[PDB]
From a paper:
We studied the disaggregase ClpB, which contains tandem ATPase domains (AAA1, AAA2) and shifts between low and high ATPase and threading activities. ClpB is composed of tandem AAA domains (AAA1, AAA2), an N-terminal domain (NTD), and a coiled-coil regulatory M-domain, which forms a repressive belt surrounding the AAA1 ring (Carroni et al., 2014, Heuck et al., 2016, Oguchi et al., 2012). ClpB activation requires two signals: (1) interaction with the Hsp70 partner chaperone and (2) binding to substrate protein (Lee et al., 2013, Oguchi et al., 2012, Rosenzweig et al., 2013, Seyffer et al., 2012). Each AAA domain extends a flexible pore loop bearing a conserved aromatic residue, in most cases a tyrosine, which interacts with the backbone of the threading polypeptide.
We therefore made use of the derepressed ClpB-K476C M-domain mutant, which mimics the transient state of ClpB activation by Hsp70 (Oguchi et al., 2012). To allow stable substrate trapping, we used a ClpB-K476C-DWB variant and incubated it with an excess of casein in the presence of ATPγS. The states were numbered according to the position of the AAA2 domain of the seam protomer F, the region undergoing the biggest conformational change and were termed KC-1, KC-2A/2B, and KC-3. KC-2A and KC-2B differ only partially in the orientation of AAA2F and show otherwise identical features; they were therefore defined as KC-2 and are described together unless specified otherwise. In state KC-2 the pore loop of AAA1E engages the substrate at the highest position, above AAA1D, while the pore loop of AAA2F is dissociated from the substrate at the lowest position. In KC-2, substrate engagement by AAA1E is linked to AAA1E activation as the arginine finger of AAA1D fully moves in. In KC-1 and KC-2, the nucleotide binding pockets of AAA2B–AAA2E show clear densities for ATPγS and receive arginine fingers of their counterclockwise neighbors, defining AAA2B – AAA2E as active. In contrast, the arginine fingers of AAA2E and AAA2F shift 12-16 Å away from the nucleotide sites of AAA2F and AAA2A, respectively, defining AAA2F and AAA2A as inactive. In KC-2, an apo AAA2A provides an arginine finger to AAA2B, while all other clockwise neighbors of active subunits AAA2 C–E bind ATP. Similarly, substrate engagement by the AAA1E pore loop in state KC-2 is coupled to substrate dissociation of the AAA2F pore loop.
Residue numbers in the entry:
A (entry chain C): 287 to 430, 441 to 466, 527 to 858
B (entry chain B): 159 to 408, 527 to 858
C (entry chain A): 159 to 287, 293 to 382
D (entry chain F): 287 to 382
Write the structure that this text describes.
Amino acid sequence: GKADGAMDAGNMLKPALARGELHCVGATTLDEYRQYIEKDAALERRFQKVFVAEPSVEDTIAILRGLKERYELHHHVQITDPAIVAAATLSHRYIADRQLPDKAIDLIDEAASSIRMQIDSKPEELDRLDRRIIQLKLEQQALMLDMLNEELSDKERQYSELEEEWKAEKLRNKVTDAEIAEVLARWTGIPVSRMMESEREKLLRMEQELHHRVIGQNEAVDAVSNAIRRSRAGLADPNRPIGSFLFLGPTGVGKTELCKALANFMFDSDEAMVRIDMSEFMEKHSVSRLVGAPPGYVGYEEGGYLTEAVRRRPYSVILLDAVEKAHPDVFNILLQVLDDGRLTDGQGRTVDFRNTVVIMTSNLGSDLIQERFGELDYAHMKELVLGVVSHNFRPEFINRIDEVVVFHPLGEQHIASIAQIQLKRLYKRLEERGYEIHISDEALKLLSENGYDPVYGARPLKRAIQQQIENPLAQQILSGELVPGKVIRLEVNEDRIVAVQH
Amino acid sequence: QALKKYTIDLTERAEQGKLDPVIGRDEEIRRTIQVLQRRTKNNPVLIGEPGVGKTAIVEGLAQRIINGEVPEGLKGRRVLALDMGALVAGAKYRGEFEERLKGVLNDLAKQEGNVILFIDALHTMVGAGKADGAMDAGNMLKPALARGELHCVGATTLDEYRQYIEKDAALERRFQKVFVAEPSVEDTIAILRGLKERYELHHHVQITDPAIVAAATLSHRYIADRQLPDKAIDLIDEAASSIRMQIDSKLRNKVTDAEIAEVLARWTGIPVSRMMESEREKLLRMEQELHHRVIGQNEAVDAVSNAIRRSRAGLADPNRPIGSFLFLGPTGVGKTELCKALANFMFDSDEAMVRIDMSEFMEKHSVSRLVGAPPGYVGYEEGGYLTEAVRRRPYSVILLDAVEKAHPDVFNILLQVLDDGRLTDGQGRTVDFRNTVVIMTSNLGSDLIQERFGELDYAHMKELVLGVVSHNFRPEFINRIDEVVVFHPLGEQHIASIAQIQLKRLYKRLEERGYEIHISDEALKLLSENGYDPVYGARPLKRAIQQQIENPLAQQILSGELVPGKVIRLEVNEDRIVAVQH
Amino acid sequence: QALKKYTIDLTERAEQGKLDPVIGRDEEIRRTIQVLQRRTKNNPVLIGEPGVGKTAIVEGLAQRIINGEVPEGLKGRRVLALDMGALVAGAKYRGEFEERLKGVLNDLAKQEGNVILFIDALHTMVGAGMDAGNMLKPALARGELHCVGATTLDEYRQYIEKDAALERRFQKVFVAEPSVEDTIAILRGLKERYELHHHVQITDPAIVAAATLSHRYIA
Amino acid sequence: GKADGAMDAGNMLKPALARGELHCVGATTLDEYRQYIEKDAALERRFQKVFVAEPSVEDTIAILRGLKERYELHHHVQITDPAIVAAATLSHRYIA
Ligand SMILES: Nc1ncnc2c1ncn2[C@@H]1O[C@H](COP(=O)(O)OP(=O)(O)OP(O)(O)=S)[C@@H](O)[C@H]1O
Ligand SMILES: Nc1ncnc2c1ncn2[C@@H]1O[C@H](COP(=O)(O)OP(=O)(O)OP(O)(O)=S)[C@@H](O)[C@H]1O
Ligand SMILES: Nc1ncnc2c1ncn2[C@@H]1O[C@H](COP(=O)(O)OP(=O)(O)OP(O)(O)=S)[C@@H](O)[C@H]1O
Ligand SMILES: Nc1ncnc2c1ncn2[C@@H]1O[C@H](COP(=O)(O)OP(=O)(O)OP(O)(O)=S)[C@@H](O)[C@H]1O
Ligand SMILES: [Mg+2]
Ligand SMILES: [Mg+2]
Ligand SMILES: [Mg+2]
Ligand SMILES: [Mg+2]
């Protein structure tokens, strides 16, 4: 209420506060105290500071066991004491901004709202299928090629199955720890929730789901798969990230494909991953471009890059591609990251990385691996290229790595399978304009033999495909020679691969 | 009342049918409905990117309250939309804004908890009525938010939240973060198939469903600025505007997908449009039209011809740039002129290209010239050269001129560029290089090529000079290159044809000046026989043409001797060249 | 009424013929008319380096509304130039900018979408002390305001592309700086008004020499 | 014009500048021009830098000879022309 008639309301109370004739119990924040009171230091002494520490997990458990019955009587549901101890423990582990017991009560109360909404209308999967069948109903109405009425028939059948099963049980009217974990996995993003059977069947086939995109390379697919299975099962070291890997080998063996296949598995898109191309980081300033500017400097109030983009979605994959192409002491930021999951940015708030999968591709032993992947067992190769890495890095940073793996030069059956994959995506690119493509098996032999050399991996297969198909084929498509509808066969001449129209 | 003066009823507008139909957004509406029916903190904030449908989730929630698709507990709730500007506007005295806000709080306590308040732009609430010593709307809604008396549905942006609401941590913890992700391609198709009826009712036209799947796919692929389903709706609506004007001017009546590609080609410049027959026959004559400026060197003309034919025919690898060429040859055989032939074909201009002159980059930090300086350092706010040059012009041609001069590790930036088509500047955003033609022009093996181009076939020449380049670059980097072409030294007849090209462009320029010039073949023979040596390329040719033509020619023009409208016969002397006026 | 306190009716001025006979720039007017007939985001922003005649484009739009060269959705509109410098005039107290601006927005809602607004120097609207983008921003979003913004290229990419919400509520119309021949056509269009004001004659070789020397010797 | 529920002078005359109904002539210091008129758009291109030179010593002599009669007829005194050139020279020499 200060104005031109400046009486400010801190001044009128102030002799009553100083003389003790007013018993004013104040309560304020800890930043707001410093920012608004300790400016005006004539009133900062009138008060006495009672500090209210953040409670422990066990004190939060003791708090929730007497608040429980009030939320029970509001939502008309029960809360079972495993959900209380799960709310306190999980909210202390997986939510880093808020503080106890605000987030514990938030998980409890929102879970009870979720159970009340189950009991009110109908359960979850009924609503999932109900929204999707009304979606496909309106979309099929608007489509008046389809390949859609199959999907609507499938979802309506599954809706009828779950509706009859719901009538057979006519459920959840308590709050178990499963509902707390569902509300935690919708708060933050970390899949803490219990694995429903489709996801568990998907996750036991991790290697089978990844070898549709990474052919060969068994050891690293195993390592990646074991890290994610430990994370979902609940055995990962809770004071470190999920998996801190270091990939090694020649050029074009699927390193960035293994990371893009991780992202396409786990988040259903290739470029949903914090990607730090470490080859911009050749000087010691890129430290500042990932942790941000310090106070006083230019990009302070715009943040860092690694810190902010992980703190948005705390469960993600981090790729540090071409990790040898950096200054050697950019890997001390990663010492903090890989040992404890904490990275303090410029502004002072510590982003938590204990749910991210840090992956570092490289090529540091390419000469050695290309020389000796034959006639050597995998353990001795890992040993000797780890000696090479010890010539590169410092023994701090490679002690923090969860597993160093070795990639190997691709054989000819590998390049046959890769040629099949690249041709499937070429069929997808040319089906959209309206062209159907087959291929002779003799022609695939020409692709596998014209795109093989041991030193460059599986990129010469890609540009051999590019030349020996895509240059005459796009030559003919622009020529108007190849009309859609008819199947474009890929047959060979004596050395060429010609397209025909029959 | 003090609500009707200052709020806007959304359920009344949904009942009147003014709102957009909201299709999709299942789990966002469901989690918001869960957070609204809590005991304490009935406060969902919808934190998402700008454009992804954060308001439309709230209006879809109002439409479900109208239709009855909500649970029984929310049937009949009045979604009121707060207006911060309507509160601040009439309050300049001490305590009029706070009076209005306390009146709103008393009415929303009076409404029996039957009101779901809504604030788009929650940060406007954060700094709302804050004057010198005034209770803003943050500090006055701050008690009635922690007790669930106010059922406020916020909405804010993902980066505006960091600026304004994480500044004030108590009002930051009043709200629950319901995150609204940018939708996928299929969901954008479904969202457009919902809203097709509204744009057809407005523009009085029809929209065909191939144009909708084309709008969603092309907007997801090419436009990097805005987001889904906003940019796809923009392509739909601007194409419908275009068809409505082309009906209404003086023909079509249904939006096709090529209309969507036209609006995309006008927004960006990437030629996604259908090939007209003039441009398609122009494009099949790629090699001949590059040999209308670059005679000689058939190989890379074939290579770049094939690359642009792939780019236009849709066979281009969409996770990579269009072509990533390396040019290797003796000095002065038209490498830079092959790139200028590219720019002159592609954009109908000569220096219409992003031209990095890599002999400036002889140390490790001109890397930082091309990307920019990080946070904290000097050239932060000015960006980078390459990143602004490509972000402002997506479909361009990048020339790394004279790429042998630099430090050996400037070409790691290019590892990112040539592998995935992306490059992160200092300010933390990536530029999409899925549309450029990255071209490098070295001369690492000009001694070897000038020595042994004779008696060695082209494949083994490429093999040998590529082995030398393998000694000079890293195996990671030559693996990324699309096609390492090799340039051959010029012959005599090639230099004669180059001189013919120079004379014809000189005659065209001086005809634009207003003159008419003829020449005898003997002058051409003298020009071909005087300035020949294979070691120096076609530049001694052009400077000999320069001297032995343009010194007497400009000597005689400036005297007024050459009257325009005559015939300038470039005859010869016993040893030199002189022009006459007959 | 708040419009008459702060707006300038351009079409009423072109009705009395005070404006310039804008000749050329036809495709930019056509793209602006494409933008102003959408459903949402009806708000073009004219963008180019300064001096190239963007207010001239909106004057030509107003003259086409007066003559009737517009489609059948713009006959009868009024083009009102808003003055962002005039709303931040008496900015003493709290909530006095918002009173003026809400008066303008209520009176524009009163006309039932009949008024094209022209907010020149659009970089003023971002920083107004929250302030001014956040009262226009929902009405800009729904397309019930038809704000023809007009700002410099560098001011646009410094002020408005920093702020993504206000950036997507507009639509760019890039204004190409005219050629030498187009400047000659402009001066041949505007020769008569200057010869009827100065009461002198102007020699057309001096016109084409003036355009050529101005393009050559001033950067 | 810092008023209440009202307008100032500048943003009420600003319509009359770009409407042709004002033949205004301004006068200001260079610095306040370079802050307050170069920053605006319409106020910039409705105004022209007629720069005023600080005059020379003999020009000041001519001006003082043009105004010697007024001050002499005012104060009933007489002014000497060597006193004029001494005053002008020492005023430009000493006063800052
Ligand atoms: N095992 C594989 N399965 C399928 N495609 C593969 C495989 N290995 C390589 N490729 C293809 O070859 C390309 C090159 O592989 P990348 O992983 O990108 O190279 P890299 O492994 O990153 O090695 P560097 O050192 O980064 S060049 C990939 O993008 C795929 O298109
Ligand atoms: N699920 C959806 N159903 C229908 N229309 C949608 C949907 N999502 C987005 N839209 C449309 O997308 C456009 C923009 O969405 P908006 O919510 O208005 O943007 P926004 O989410 O408000 O983000 P800001 O912060 O206002 S820029 C509108 O035309 C909406 O109708
Ligand atoms: N086939 C050709 N047709 C026309 N002009 C050509 C041809 N080959 C070379 N030239 C001329 O060669 C001259 C020099 O070409 P540039 O490409 O600029 O030199 P360069 O190829 O870059 O060699 P370096 O190593 O960079 S010095 C140009 O002025 C061209 O006119
Ligand atoms: N096509 C045109 N027809 C007629 N006059 C034009 C044309 N283009 C520009 N002009 C004139 O050029 C001048 C430019 O006027 P303005 O539009 O105010 O300037 P501008 O191009 O908008 O640049 P700014 O950023 O507003 S200073 C005026 O005298 C116009 O009459
Ligand atoms: Mg890689
Ligand atoms: Mg919004
Ligand atoms: Mg060159
Ligand atoms: Mg202007």
